[PDB]
Design a protein around this ligand. Structure first.
Ligand SMILES: Nc1nc2c(ncn2[C@@H]2O[C@H](COP(=O)(O)OP(=O)(O)OP(=O)(O)O)[C@@H](O)[C@H]2O)c(=O)[nH]1
Ligand SMILES: [Mg+2]
Lengths: 142, 180, 10, 415, 570, 198, 18
């Protein structure tokens, strides 16, 4: 299960955040700052895997804005990367040429897509088209 | 400024008002709210959270926020004290041991300085068993006459029958509205 | 800028 | 003994750098931003940094922090004074202090930086004198810099000889929450805008208590200024001998002397405020302001800042006189009064809501600050006696001066 | 781009040359490595327009160390520019020559420096004085061979007060790096001459003129009195550093002045108003002023004895200023303003700065320890703070009470009952250990000392080493004082700290306690529960040798950090 | 009622941290003023602005009762906004999610497949030690349904309840029996995850 | 006129002190 997922920009600004662990607000902010500092203080050949606080922190940013996850030491590491790539592809398909500008304005849509895709740190839909159809149907409800 | 629109709205009815629904668990609060809104005795599970509804009568939209009597939900009634205009308390005369607890809870809720404009609304619930007292013995036990600067009104309503609900609504409208 | 660019460019 | 004075930006980019000794590598500026971030995030942020054997002592300007690298045990006070002089020069040359002028006036900025300080030792800092040698739109340097008089350029000719003075008063009161005033000091400010022909030698004369005692007139109202800070044009020896204020006024507005003495009189404005804040229910502000100043004086633009709750919403103000507005950016009730006659009494009754849910952390109790500014009122009672304007050619001057009374550090401690 | 810029710079049109120079300056300022084009700009060097010459000189100075070989094509240009009729051009050329960090270029610049040393233009004289110091710093041997020391010495004895101040500053810088051999010290005539030009010096030259007197040591009171009288007018200078320099000079001269004469009293009286005026400076200078006051406070505490109101921390005061205000108040704390200090500390305890709150608690404890006349007031304030129900404030109050009890525990029995139930659930190691020590040493006014220690013995083996040692000491003291109610508790503590305790020091202490209990419990009363001697408090006053050395180092980095100049430089 | 895009542009227009904080406070003042009046028309915009401010690093304690009020609303947009607020600013240590149990129970029996799914997702994301105790009976009812879009949500809710309440795993043994023949990949994955967790 | 107090003419010296 994914302990937390945070979408942080290259400048350090966070465009998305979804933590599956009930933590204090100050503690959550400190953890996010530490994760940003570690990721922001990492090179391009670090393997995109960090063991921070015994958590498999995997970083794989496809643009200026990076992505982060908190995976416990009980599952494979490539599965998290595959899930992140699938989520990025689904978000791009739902939005259409998803860029940084649309992420800030359409943060609610991204949060709804993440909720409909992953719940509680675990996956909810392995397919990429069924989730998109469900999201479109939910949006069309008004 | 011009108040022509306000006068036009008031010519056909504009005031709506608000209301609160508090009381102990299993006190007929959910059933009373269902009867007021729908008109049928709907059987519901204990109110873990809260119920919010509105009643349209006499051109006034009486919005009712039902509140349960759970121990963990008793101190949560302070959340509904903000932006609240009315307050209706439903008594449970069928619980002799819980009568003291209900009176203590009513005193604790009435001892708040923010909830001052909410007039007292005592509802004689569970008016279907012979063990239920009259409309004065319960008031005498609760000492409703000792509430200084409080406009309280005791009304007995039978959950199975529904009698007295119209009288209670009329009394609430007369207390809230000071016009013809 | 660098923000208008697509996340994956697909 | 600064090694390299540089100008940074809000994003860490160095707007301009100018090494003076070269004892510090220019790449050390990269660690300045992370060091500042660490100090601020851990509470260790200070104006003087330290990157190993090199210290980064600088202050933060309007838009950028002027960091000046140094390696030896240089005079930190000298570095601060040089930074202040540079800021003043930039303000005089450029009306705004922002990155818009840093990237647009580099041609003159570089020349000014090179001319101001050489080898870490500044030599010229007069903006008026410096404007005659470096221009953004070169002749020989003026003789004023080489001559002893570096604050009065020769050859200045004007149609009239009018000097405008400004006796600005600063009423600073440190009133504790118990109702007692702890820090009650008034600092005089004699700012003059001299505009005459030539280089007159002003002979300042006021009603000082020390001067009256020395001359034998220590019986009338005399100002007992604890500290008097004369300007560069004022001769220190003349003041030290017999309190003779003899100096050459410059061309433009400048601060000649700055009096500063303690105040033992009653406050001009007495504020009686009450806080009937219910526990997450409501709040009351029984604020009453009593003007203890003279009735003949009017406090124009009275702004008594009343700190309201940070999470308070739906506020209602029941006051008597003056516009009352709550600013969400400042999170306080601004008791704004246009004209406040002396002896006036304003009563206010605040009423604002509060959320039922308590706040996660405490926000503190900001003090109540009054922004009263009553002109034509000399609280200290110091009056100018004479101003000896003497010129070699000989002319009749028309000096002018005005007294302005305002509130300085006049904050009231909250309960 | 680069090719286009080179073509523009290799053109015969001044209009395009100026644009190319501006673009090159912007690229370097924009963060572009334009050092590859230094030889290209070398050809466009001798220009009549002064605007392009300054940019070229700046580029050469900034592109001198990167390409020292390419800088060999500028000596002739510098030599030609060193004789320009315009004083500004000569000054710029002299500044650029000294700014060029080239080892093979300074050798050929000795002749222009010698020619410009006797320049009639005061700006030229100052530029030559700066260039001589720069050359000496770059190459001391070359400067010594050139014999510029004699010219520098005569520079102070010439006209142009700004040039004299610049020469004095250059000589001080050279002697600062010099090994003190062949010092440039001057007799009283030189000091009088400098004082004569001191009143004509500018704001920057005033510091240079006053720094010279910082090294000179007066030998007679008349000379010291004259120096004090001449430096007295400097206390009314608008420049904060000038006032600070004058104060430092007066403090240095006071080491030879006689306190019997009225000069010392007048100097002490005239120094407080200067400190008060400096206390109203900018927030950046507030820390420097506080450091200077602290350095001078430990030397002459009789000057600022009555200066207490100005030490109050303001609401908008900076954190670096707020922290220093507490230290200044503690250094100036006395029974005369004990109530004012307590009131200020009480107000400072309602702030939101956790570090500020800890600093205020430490200052209150230090004031309570230093002055015994306000011990009751400090105890009452600590009790009120503890009743304030603040975790950090509770820990600070516990630490302060633990410190005070070891210092003045004779009349500290009236607070044990209040502290018996003060929310002992706090897990702060500095507070739990202090509470345990207070209970163990003060286990007489609390009838439930054994019951309170029972809760702390649940995790004694895994709480901490210091906490475990304090708990063991408290248990041993309770057993020695009252062994009837703690007979089994002592055995349990010995079993837990001797069998299940793996700490070396803790295990040794437990074994020693067990041996003492099994050898002679009666002797443990006089051995363990004995009357300890008076605790020697850590004096905050610096050593007199450091204070005397720090007195001369006024306004520098060694004074703000309160460290020796050789202990912080690299 | 300022739009979310307008608020985002206004925030992006602020450069200084102090200026950004001042703008955030100015927006929060209007948000609190609207909330204190019991606004129900433009509540979605205010909720979005409050969520953005909280994610940007500003307090949102006062916007707690508004989320509870909007959760028990009937509008789909209002219900979605309330669910998002409960998922973001609501946690086990918040202490205000206890009243959300009744709202979840009311929405757990909703005929709409989106409201029930949103409530289940919110319960799984913010599962509490007491909410799962009073919600175990309703969770098991949905686990036996044939809704493919709801089977995965029911499996996730059961897994979350088991993780929060390890002693409640005994009530899920008879519900997951004979569930390995699901044609949908998501249902099979959820069943496999639930079996592995058990 | 001018806010903060109208400007007033200043004297030349203390005529009463010689
Ligand atoms: N048969 C009968 N039962 C009644 C009557 N009046 C009250 N009750 C009891 O009161 C309960 C009413 O519960 P609800 O309608 O769900 O609402 P509530 O009174 O607020 O109870 P909670 O939800 O637990 O807070 C029923 O379960 C009945 O057992 C009545 O007139 N006849
Ligand atoms: Mg009910």
């Amino acid at each position: 299960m994914i302990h937390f997922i945070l979408l942080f920009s290259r400048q350090g600004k966070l465009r998305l955040q979804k933590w599956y662990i009930t933590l204090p607000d100050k503690e959550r902010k400190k953890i996010t700052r530490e994760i940003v500092q570690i990721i922001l203080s990492r090179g391009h050949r670090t393997s995109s895997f960090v063991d921070w606080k015994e958590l498999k922190l995997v970083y794989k940013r496809y643009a200026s804005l990076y992505f982060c996850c908190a995976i416990e030491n009980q599952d494979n590491e490539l599965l998290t990367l595959e899930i992140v790539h699938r989520y990025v592809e689904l978000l791009d398909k739902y939005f259409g040429n998803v860029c940084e500008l649309d992420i800030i304005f359409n943060f609610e849509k991204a949060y709804f897509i993440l909720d409909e895709f992953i719940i509680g740190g675990e996956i909810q839909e392995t397919s990429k088209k069924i989730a998109v159809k469900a999201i479109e149907d939910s949006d069309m409800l008004q | 400024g011009n108040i022509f629109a306000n006068l036009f709205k008031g010519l056909f009815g504009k005031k709506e008002m608000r209301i609160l629904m508090v009381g102990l668990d299993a006190a007929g609060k959910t059933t009373i709210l269902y009867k007021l809104k729908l008109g049928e005795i709907v059987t519901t599970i204990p109110t873990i959270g809260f119920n919010v509804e509105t009643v349209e009568y006499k051109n006034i939209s009486f919005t009712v926020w039902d509140v349960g009597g759970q121990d963990k939900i008793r101190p949560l009634w302070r959340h509904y004290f903000q932006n609240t205009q009315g307050l209706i308390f439903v008594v449970d005369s069928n619980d002799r041991e819980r009568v003291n607890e209900a009176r203590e809870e009513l005193m604790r809720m009435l001892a708040e300085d923010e909830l001052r404009d909410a007039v007292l609304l005592v509802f004689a619930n569970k008016q279907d068993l012979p063990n239920a007292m009259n409309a004065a013995e319960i008031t005498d036990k609760l000492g409703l006459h000792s509430l200084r600067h409080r406009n309280w009104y005791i009304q007995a309503t039978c959950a199975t029958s529904g009698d007295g609900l119209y009288e209670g609504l009329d009394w609430l409208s007369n207390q809230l509205r000071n016009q013809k | 800028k660098g923000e208008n660019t697509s996340l994956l460019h697909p | 003994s600064a090694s390299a004075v540089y100008v940074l930006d809000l994003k860490g980019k160095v707007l301009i750098c100018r090494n003076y000794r070269g004892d510090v590598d220019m790449s050390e500026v990269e660690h300045f931003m992370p060091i500042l971030m660490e100090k601020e995030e851990e509470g260790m942020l200070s104006p003087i940094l330290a990157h190993g054997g090199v210290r980064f002592m600088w202050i933060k300007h309007n838009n950028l922090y002027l960091v000046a690298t140094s390696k030896k045990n240089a005079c930190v006070s000298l570095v601060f004074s040089f930074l202040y002089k540079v800021v003043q020069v930039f303000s005089e040359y450029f009306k705004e202090l922002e990155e818009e002028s840093i990237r647009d006036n580099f041609v003159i900025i570089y020349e000014l930086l090179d001319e101001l300080m050489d080898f870490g030792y500044p030599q010229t800092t007069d903006s008026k004198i410096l404007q005659e040698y470096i221009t953004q739109e070169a002749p020989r340097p003026p003789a004023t810099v080489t001559n002893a008089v570096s604050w009065r350029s020769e050859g200045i000719k004007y149609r009239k000889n009018e000097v405008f003075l400004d006796v600005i008063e600063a009423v600073n009161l440190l009133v504790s929450a118990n109702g007692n005033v702890l820090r009650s000091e008034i600092v005089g400010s004699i700012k003059m805008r001299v505009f005459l022909s030539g280089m007159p030698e002003l002979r300042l004369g006021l009603n000082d208590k020390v001067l009256f005692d020395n001359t034998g007139r220590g019986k009338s109202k005399s100002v007992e200024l604890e500290d008097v800070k004369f300007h560069q044009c004022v001769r220190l020896s003349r003041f030290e001998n017999d309190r003779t204020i003899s100096f050459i006024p410059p061309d433009g507005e400048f601060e000649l002397m700055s009096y500063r003495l303690n105040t033992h009189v009653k406050p001009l404005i007495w504020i009686e405020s009450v806080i009937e804040k219910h526990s997450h229910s409501r709040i009351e502000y029984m604020v009453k302001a009593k003007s203890q100043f003279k009735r003949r004086s009017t406090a124009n633009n009275v702004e008594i800042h009343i700190p309201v709750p940070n999470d308070a919403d739906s506020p209602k103000f029941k006051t008597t006189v003056g516009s009352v507005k709550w600013v969400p950016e400042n999170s306080e009730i601004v008791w704004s009064v246009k004209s406040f006659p002396g002896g006036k009494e304003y009563l206010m009754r605040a009423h604002f809501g509060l959320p039922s849910v308590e706040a996660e952390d405490k926000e503190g109790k900001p003090p109540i600050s009054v922004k009263f500014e009553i002109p034509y009122f000399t609280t200290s009672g110091i009056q100018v006696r004479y101003l000896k304007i003497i010129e070699k050619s000989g002319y009749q001057a028309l000096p002018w001066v005005r007294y302005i009374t305002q509130n300085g550090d006049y904050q009231l401690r909250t309960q | 781009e680069i090719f286009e810029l080179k073509a523009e710079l290799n053109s015969d049109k001044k209009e395009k040359k100026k644009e190319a120079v501006k673009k090159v300056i912007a690229s370097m300022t924009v963060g572009k490595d334009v050092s590859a084009l230094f030889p290209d700009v070398v050809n466009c060097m001798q220009t009549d327009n002064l605007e392009l010459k300054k940019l070229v000189y700046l580029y050469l100075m900034n592109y001198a160390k990167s390409q020292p070989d390419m800088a060999i094509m500028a000596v002739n240009t510098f030599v030609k520019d060193c004789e320009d009729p315009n004083p500004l051009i000569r000054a710029l050329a002299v500044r650029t020559m000294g700014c060029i960090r080239v080892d093979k270029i300074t050798e050929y610049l000795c002749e222009p420096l010698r020619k410009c040393l006797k320049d009639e233009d005061p700006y030229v004289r100052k530029t030559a004085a700066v260039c001589v110091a720069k050359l000496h710093d770059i190459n001391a041997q070359l400067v010594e061979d050139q014999g510029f020391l004699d010219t520098l010495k005569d520079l102070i004895s010439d006209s142009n007060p700004m040039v004299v101040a610049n020469a004095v500053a250059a000589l001080s810088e050279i002697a600062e790096s010099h090994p003190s051999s062949n010092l440039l010290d001057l007799n009283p005539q030189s000091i009088n001459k400098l004082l004569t030009a001191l009143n004509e010096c500018t704001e920057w030259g005033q510091i240079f003129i006053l720094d010279c007197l910082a090294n000179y040591m007066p030998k007679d009171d008349r000379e010291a009195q004259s120096i004090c009288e001449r430096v007295t007018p400097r206390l009314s200078h608008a420049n904060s550093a000038v006032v600070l320099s004058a104060v430092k000079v007066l403090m240095k001269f006071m080491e030879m002045l006689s306190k019997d004469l009225d000069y010392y009293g007048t100097l002490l009286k005239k120094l407080a108003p200067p400190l008060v005026t400096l206390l109203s400076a900018e927030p950046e200078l507030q820390y420097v002023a506080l450091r200077n006051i602290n350095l001078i406070v430990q030397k002459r505490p009789e000057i600022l004895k009555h200066e207490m109101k100005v030490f109050f921390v303001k609401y908008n005061d900076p954190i670096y200023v707020k922290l220093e205000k507490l230290d200044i108040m503690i250094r100036l704390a006395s029974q005369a303003n004990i109530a004012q200090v307590l009131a200020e500390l009480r107000e400072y305890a309602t702030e939101v700065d956790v570090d500020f709150v800890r600093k205020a608690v430490r200052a209150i404890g230090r004031c309570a320890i230093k002055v015994e006349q306000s011990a009751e007031r400090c105890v009452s304030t600590l009790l009120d703070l503890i009743q304030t129900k603040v975790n950090y404030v509770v820990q600070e109050a516990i630490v302060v009470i633990k410190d005070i009890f070891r210092k003045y525990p004779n009349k500290y029995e009236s607070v044990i009952a209040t502290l018996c139930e003060n929310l002992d659930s706090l897990d702060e190691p500095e507070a739990r250990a202090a509470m345990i020590w207070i209970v163990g040493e003060y286990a007489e006014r609390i009838d439930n000392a054994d019951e309170l220690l029972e809760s702390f013995l649940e995790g004694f083996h895994d709480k901490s080493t210091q906490v475990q040692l304090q708990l063991l000491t408290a248990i041993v003291k309770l057993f020695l004082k009252k062994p009837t109610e703690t007979q089994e508790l002592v055995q349990q503590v010995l079993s837990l700290a001797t069998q299940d305790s793996d700490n070396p020091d803790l295990r040794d202490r437990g074994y020693i306690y067990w041996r003492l209990l099994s050898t002679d419990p009666v002797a443990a009363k006089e051995v363990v529960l004995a009357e300890k001697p008076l605790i020697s408090e850590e004096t905050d006053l610096i050593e007199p040798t450091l204070l005397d050395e720090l007195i001369c180092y006024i306004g520098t980095l060694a004074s703000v950090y309160h460290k020796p100049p050789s202990a912080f430089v690299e | 009622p300022i739009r979310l895009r307008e608020l985002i542009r206004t925030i992006r227009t602020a450069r200084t941290q102090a200026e950004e904080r001042e703008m955030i406070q100015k927006e929060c003042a209007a948000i609190r003023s609207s909330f204190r009046e019991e606004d129900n028309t433009y509540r979605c915009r205010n909720v979005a602005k409050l969520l953005y401010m909280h994610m940007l690093g500003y307090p949102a304690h006062f916007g707690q009762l508004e989320c509870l009020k909007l959760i028990a609303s009937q509008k789909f947009t209002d219900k979605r906004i309330g669910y998002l607020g409960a998922m973001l600013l609501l946690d086990e240590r918040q202490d205000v999610h206890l009243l959300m149990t009744n709202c979840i129970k009311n929405d757990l029996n909703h005929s709409t497949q989106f409201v029930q799914g949103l409530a289940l997702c919110t319960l799984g994301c913010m599962g509490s030690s007491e909410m799962c105790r009073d919600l175990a009976g309703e969770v098991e009812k949905l686990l036996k349904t044939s809704n493919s879009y709801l089977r995965k949500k029911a499996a996730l809710c059961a897994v979350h309840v088991i993780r929060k309440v390890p002693e409640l795993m005994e009530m899920f043994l008879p519900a997951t029996k004979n569930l390995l023949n699901e044609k949908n990949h998501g249902v099979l994955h959820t069943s496999v995850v639930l079996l592995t967790e058990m | 006129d001018r806010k903060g107090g109208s400007y007033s003419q200043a004297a030349g010296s203390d005529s009463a002190q010689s």
